[PDB]
Ligand binder design. Structure first.
Ligand SMILES: CCNC(=O)c1cc2c(N[C@H](c3ccc4c(c3)OCCO4)C(C)C)ncnc2[nH]1
Length: 168
């Protein structure tokens, strides 16, 4: 149903909210929820652990069967699988982990995957323990994504910093 509410409009197609992506998925019932994935789809930590626990591990069982046959994704790549109880589909997107020395330039490729979908609920890619500068990730999002993206950032201090910086 894509019933998004309470978002700050940053550009004609990018929106942001201080919210838990799991609670947004339950309220909004989106066509697509984006997971902040890693290449072998191990859904621990961060957004991935939160989404997988909210599916009672159904996402991890489906992801393990996908990886057994298809092997890992690449950094910057993505994979559509079921959204289970949270969405129609989950778009698993791998941003670079700069705290592990991955290439920050591939963050543009990671966001480009969003352009195959008319509307998405998503986290801020490569943030948290992946180490990218959040202000930089929001700029790459705004400059790359053309479809309608609703960003849920579950940290009030980070959200207030991003909004203040974007409005400069
Ligand atoms: C109570 C259950 N819910 C949650 O624990 C939860 C965590 C959430 C989150 N985390 C951000 C993040 C964004 C990209 C990430 C990442 C972490 O980890 C590493 C890979 O990339 C963080 C910067 C605030 N963003 C949005 N909704 C979230 N919900």
């Amino acid at each position: 149903v894509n019933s998004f509410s309470g978002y700050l409009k940053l550009t004609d197609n990018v929106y942001i909210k201080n919210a838990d992506i799991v609670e947004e998925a339950k309220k909004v019932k989106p066509t697509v929820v984006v997971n902040a994935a890693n290449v072998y789809l191990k859904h621990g930590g961060g957004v991935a652990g939160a989404l997988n626990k909210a599916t009672n591990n159904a996402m991890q069982v489906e992801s393990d069967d996908y990886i057994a046959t298809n092997g890992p994704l690449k950094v910057g790549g993505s994979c559509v699988l079921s959204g289970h109880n949270l969405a129609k589909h989950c778009l698993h997107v791998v941003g670079p982990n700069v705290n592990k020395g991955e290439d920050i330039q591939l963050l543009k490729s990671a966001y480009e995957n969003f352009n195959q979908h008319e509307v998405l609920l998503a986290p801020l890619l490569s943030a948290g323990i992946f180490g990218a500068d959040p202000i930089h990730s929001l700029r790459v999002c705004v400059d790359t994504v053309r479809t309608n993206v609703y960003l849920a950032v579950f940290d009030k201090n980070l959200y207030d910093k991003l909004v203040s910086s974007f409005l400069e």
